[PDB]
Structure formats: C-alpha cells, structure tokens
Symmetry: C3
Subunit: 295 residues, 3 copies
C-alpha cells in the first residue's frame, strides 16, 4: 500500500477509565507500526495502539464499554469487534474512516477471556496483519480456585504470514507462530507476538506456586494445543467461564479465537517451556518460557 | 467418470414416515447432481437426494430407523453410515450397487446432532464429492433450556475441493468452505453448501430472541471454530447431548463430524455474521448471516 | 546422518519393576530402528526401545517414577518428557549423550492418558522421527463406569513425514497418519504406527461388549477427530481424568498430545472401523479395525 510506505506510527498507550459502577471508557487507535516478529524480520503491522496483539483490556462482568476507535491509518478503514460483548455487528462494529474517530457502546455481561479484533472486510486481512487482542471480563463471583492462585499472567497465541499477502493468508502455512504476554499488574512484561522475547526474558515465578494463565488463541487460522512442560493443569475453565471447569488436563484444545483460564503448580526450580503442542507451530516460534526460582 | 458426463439428476424429496411409536421409515437416493458451490462454479456432486449436504433427518431418541437407499448413480456404488445409530458396519453400512436398492435397520438411542455420510471406499472420495448430512435425534426429555428458545435453525459446515481429485482431497487446502441450512419447520430455508446463499438470503430473527442452532461440521477434513458475531453462546450442548452442557462460550470447537446445540441471544437489530473463526476458511466462503429485525 | 547409515538396532524390552508401594523403576532405551510404516516403506525411526510409538507404560496415581534412559544412538543426544509428571524440565528432562545413561525421578500424581516423548531440541525433529508414546496413570478410585467395561485396548495416533526432513516436518502435510495398539494384558497386540497392521489383524471383541479405549494423539502436528464407526461413545473422560466426563459423543476432538478414555458398546457382529474423521488423514492410513464376533 503506497500510503503505508515508510510509515511507522509510534505506539500510543491504551486509555481507559471507569465512569460509573458498571460503565467504562476505552480509547484505542488503529495504527501502522513496525514490529520485529523474528530476529531480523520486520512486519509493518496493522495494529491497535502499535502493539500486535493489541493492548490488554480488563473489565468486570456487567460493565458497559463505551469504546472509541481513533483511526490513524492514512488510507484503510478499521473497526472493532469485542467477542465479550452483545452488540449489533452492522451498527456497532462498523468502520471508522482514515483520520476519523467512532464511539460505540455495548455490554460485557459474560465472564471470560475473549478475543477482540478488527472487523473490516476482508476480516482475514485485518486480523492476519495484526489487528487482534484479548479482553478479560472478570467474573462477579470469581473462580472457585481463586484462593489457591499465587501468580498470574496473560498469554496470547497468534500467527504471522507473508506480508499483506491474501493468497498466503488463505492458502499458505504460517511463517511464524508466536506467544506474547500482556500486563495485568505493574511490573508484568508487555510484549508483542514474536518468536524470541519470552524465551530470552522468561515469565518469572517461585518454586511451589500455583500459576494462573489467561490464554487466548487469536489465530487467524490455526487451532492451538496449549501445554506447559513439566506440569499438568490442575484446573481449566474453558473460555474463562467458571462453569466450564475441567481438571487434570495435560493439554487444552483452543479453537481459533478460543480462550481459557488454566492453573498449574510448578514444583521444582528450573525453566518450564510453554508450547502449542502442534510442534510445527512450536518450531516456528510458539515456545515461551517460565523461569521458576527459589525466590 | 465417463458415465457421469452430462448427468444431472433432478433432486428427489426425502421420503420419511413413522410406522410405529418407536419406528420410522426413511428412503433416500444416491444421485449425481450439479450444484453451484460458488458464483459461476458448478460441482457435479455425489449426493443424497440431489442436495449437498443431504436432506435433514429428524427422529426421536429410541426410534429404530428402517432405511432404504435407492442408488441412481449409473456406475458408482454408494452406502449410508448414520453416526446416530448402533449398527454393524460390515453388514448394515454396505454398498448398494448402481440401479439397485438396499434396506437396513438400526436404532438411534442417543440424543444429538449427528453426521451421516456415504461409507463406500474410499470414504474420503465419497464424502468430499458431497455425500454428507445431518441426522438430529431429539432427546426424550428435552434440553434444560428448551423453554427459553424462541427460534431455531440447522447449520452445516462442509468443504469443497478440486473436482473428484483424490490428490487434492488428501493433500490440498480446501477451495471453498461453506455453510448450509436445512429446514426444521415449514418456511425455513433449505440450502446447499455454497459460498453465497446465506449471505444474500440471511436467516431471520427478531430482536431479543434466544436462538438455537443445531450445528455439525461434516468436513471432510477440517475442524471448525464456530462463532456468531455480536453475541456469546449462553448454552452449548456438545454433540447435542444434554449432559455435555457448557456455558458462556465465545467459540465452539467442532472436530470433523462434530456437532453441537448452541443457544445465544440477539439483543439489537442488525445483521449478525456466523463464521468459522479459522478465518482462511471464512474467507473461502464460510460466513452465513442472521438478519435480526424489530418484527 | 552418516552414523545412522546401516544402523538397525533390534528392539529391547521395556524394563519396569515396582520398588515400593508408591515407587516404580522404568528403564528405556533410545535407539535407531527400521520400521515398516506402509507396505514397502521403511522409516529408520528414532525410537524408545525400537518401537514407534514407544512401549506402553502403566503406573498408579501417586507413583514416583525413577526413570533411566540408556542412549544407544551413536551420535544424537536424547531425553524423556512424561506429560504425566511434575518435574523441572531444565533439570529432569535433560539430554543423555550417545552411549550414556541418565536417571531422573518424578511423581505421577494425576490420573490419565498422557503423552511421553523425547524433549531434545529441536523437539519437532525428535517427535516426528518417532520418539513418542503413552503413559497411563490409573486413578486411585477408578472411573465410575469401570464395572460396565468388558474389554479394553490402547490406541495411539501419530503421523509420519518425509524422512528426517525438517522443512517437511514444519511446512508439509503428513505422508501417513496411523494408529498403533500397545498391550495392556498378555495376548493383547503390540504394534507400531503403520498404515496396515490393525486392518489386517483387527482388535477383537465379542457381541454386546462395552469396550474401553485408552487413546492419545501424539501428533506431532495434527489434531484428531476420533470416531468408532457403528457406535456412539457412551462415556468419555477427557485426558483420562474421571472428572472430565462427557456422554454420548459421536467424535472426540483430541489436540496434539491429547488423550482420552472412551467407552462404547458393539451391539452386532461385524467389523467396525476406527478412524480419525479428518478423512484426509484416514485415507493416509489412520483406519484401524475392531472385529466383533459371537464368541
Ligand atoms: Cu451495581
Ligand atoms: Cu460514556
Ligand atoms: Cu482493520
Ligand atoms: Cu471474531
Ligand atoms: Cu497450517
Ligand atoms: Cu501456593
Ligand atoms: Cu501440573
Ligand atoms: Cu413407547
Ligand atoms: Cu420397516
Ligand atoms: Cu458414495
Ligand atoms: Cu463417519
Ligand atoms: Cu486445511
Ligand atoms: Cu425470548
Ligand atoms: Cu451471546
Ligand atoms: Cu500408600
Ligand atoms: Cu529408585
Ligand atoms: Cu530424541
Ligand atoms: Cu510434550
Ligand atoms: Cu496437515
Ligand atoms: Cu457388558
Ligand atoms: Cu455407541
């Protein structure tokens, strides 16, 4: 796209504020930003806020979201679809033109770990170019295992293809498959989908802790066979809904856009890989690390 | 196949009648019929009754099915495998030769949303050429959420490949991935697996309704990441068995041949896309529409 | 690999002995062994004990495993990762050099049907070349349906690619997809992952029996849509954990490394195919047979 040549829009922070007991404002941008997806490989991603996946959003069950999208793309329209919400797609997930803003309002009344993404046709193109993310909706009454959890992180799986190549997006294998982590609390890492960051700078934990991961596989195209090496999931909540409670799973099947909350114990010091167990995808990048120490 | 050149057998209605409190007769054909799978693209499908997927069958839990297949194919044998039934494959799912009929009898004692398909070797060929469908077995005691449902439809996912090309069937990506709808009540649409019909003539609903979809992914080869844009599934019953009850799922993973009953609320007027969230497949056809109006 | 040319190490029996009420010794080899994966097609597999998948391991919930790997490979290091265990990957799943042995100790405190595999980088290579298997951990309190089961077998799904070809492992479709069976009791068959053995020498059962299968899809790369023709699963326990109990499933979705216990009734004499319902994979080998007779 001629109007994207040389464009690299600096990342913009997510803006969010609570405006009532059950109402929250969220302001995001659509922007074109160079991301290093593998060592030496730059992808001029289509993004929310200059991150791919986009920034984490966390709301409470029952919150209405008043969402604004500021489109900084010079030429392509963009939009937003939150899987958390009940909305009219053809009224509420509509396009925002270049250099314009749009505000849409909709309720999040289901707890869980939801995908969000651009909804502009062709949706495959917009998702594959980087316009995906996660929204977490925290359950009003928690999870039954909350009191057991010592530490928590967010992980997101996505794929990358040949740049802006619809034939490859539709017909080709992924070039890379990757994990990212998005911060829940100060000090947590906040990364983009690349093949290396979470190997070189592992997530951290302490021996004996029960870890919770909020996970989502945004695709665009693959399913995920999510596994943590050296442990078994004690508890799994499919899509993050507390009712969908499995126990003692080695591996969690996630559809494309599929989420879960998973909990596991790390019993011994060491480095614990986190993979999709579709090992072609692991080989193409989808291995993160969790470094477990005595402190 | 030389004996299929120029052959286009007009669709024949499904014949079904109840013959006792727990016994039903079903009569289907195997036939060769031209279907427009994408605009301008004709596939000379191998079909049941001139539809691909085939006609919907609905029986009650505990019904014995007395099934007749009339093979109108001039040269290829065909057969029938209902996933609903307990049967001897090597006695009851056997071939019916060209211009012959065969009758087989077997019980449907499990509720759910089951695939049916031709079982003639090579099964991949027969399924990929169009010989798939769904049988619904209604549970004796219903679903716990029945009283909440306002409207219901059947949707089926399938893929199409290069015509009668076993190399492509085994080794290639799908050319198209598609939804169809099959009628449960008079006035419901009844369509074939194509890339366009359910976009141009959306399924219809009213604002505020709870919708039930009976769904099955017949493959042959892909899994499905089933999602309705702008809502969350309130309730999911895997394979349509009332015991396999999930809640608040954004997306339902369906294996090949996998079914479900899913229920969701449409809260606002508008058009709601229905997708597999493996967006390469969505781009290749697998997007249906649900138009929601005030009336 | 020059040092594998002409190498064909005869299979070595698994060695296992109980050494306390809650402690077991297991001794396995890593070895290079020619396996006929399809008629006329030899793969010089990387194996545990000269089988691919490797030998079955069965322990009780709460057993600590004291595992020794004897590496008979002349040049490549190997390792062992049991998905059943809680362990430090970077201390306990480490490499054993050529012509050396290593012993690692770790507890199996979760019931189920777990993958095991070599964990040596690149893990894709080691798994794809044949270094996979299953460990079953029997639940302390059984499954609620135990008293109903008449007969049981183990089945494992794996794929085979072009020989030792990392490009194909990462980017290519499988050449073959296959089932194997591993013995639980004397007289049970014990086979390797090939396209033919379980078709020519079917698993055996009697009319009217309830059959339990312990199943795992080891991949490396594909998910599995597990189905038995002519029946419906009465009960399914995901990953073999008794809590993850589904009923009346036609088809069980297994992620890569995913397991289950499945139970079904064979009501009529005959031969019942067992498939992954991703029929491209079935066509490439993944069809086993269960021959059901009056005796
Ligand atoms: Cu309030
Ligand atoms: Cu507001
Ligand atoms: Cu966009
Ligand atoms: Cu979506
Ligand atoms: Cu792929
Ligand atoms: Cu703790
Ligand atoms: Cu664990
Ligand atoms: Cu009766
Ligand atoms: Cu009759
Ligand atoms: Cu046929
Ligand atoms: Cu089938
Ligand atoms: Cu495909
Ligand atoms: Cu209503
Ligand atoms: Cu909803
Ligand atoms: Cu004891
Ligand atoms: Cu010992
Ligand atoms: Cu190895
Ligand atoms: Cu593993
Ligand atoms: Cu494949
Ligand atoms: Cu019995
Ligand atoms: Cu059955």
């Amino acid at each position: 796209i001629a109007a994207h040549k040389g464009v690299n829009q600096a990342p913009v922070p997510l803006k969010m504020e609570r405006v009532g007991p059950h109402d929250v404002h969220i302001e995001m941008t659509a922007q074109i930003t160079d991301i290093e997806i593998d060592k030496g490989k730059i992808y001029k991603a289509w993004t929310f806020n200059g991150q791919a996946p986009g920034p984490l959003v966390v709301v409470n069950e029952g919150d209405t979201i008043h969402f604004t999208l500021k489109n900084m793309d010079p030429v392509v329209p963009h939009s937003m679809d939150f899987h958390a919400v009940h909305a009219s797609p053809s009224k509420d997930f509509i396009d925002v033109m270049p250099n314009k803003s749009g505000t849409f309002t909709y309720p999040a009344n289901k707890p869980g770990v939801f995908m969000y993404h651009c909804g502009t046709k062709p949706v495959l193109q917009h998702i594959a170019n980087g316009m995906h993310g996660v929204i977490i909706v925290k359950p009003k009454n928690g999870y039954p295992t909350d009191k057991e959890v010592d530490r928590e992180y967010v992980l997101i799986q996505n794929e990358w293809y040949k740049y802006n190549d619809m034939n490859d997006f539709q017909n080709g294998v992924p070039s890379y498959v990757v994990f990212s982590s998005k911060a829940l609390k100060p000090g947590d890492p906040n990364t983009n989908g690349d093949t290396f960051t979470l190997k070189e700078k592992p997530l951290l934990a302490k021996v004996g802790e029960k870890i919770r991961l909020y996970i989502n596989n945004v695709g665009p195209n693959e399913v995920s066979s999510f596994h943590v090496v050296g442990t078994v999931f004690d508890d799994v909540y499919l899509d993050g809904n507390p009712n969908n409670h499995l126990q003692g799973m080695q591996t969690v099947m996630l559809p494309a856009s599929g989420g879960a909350v998973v909990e596991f114990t790390v019993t011994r010091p060491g480095t614990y890989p986190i993979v999709t167990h579709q090992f072609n995808h692991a080989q193409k990048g989808a291995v993160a690390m969790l470094k477990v120490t005595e402190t």
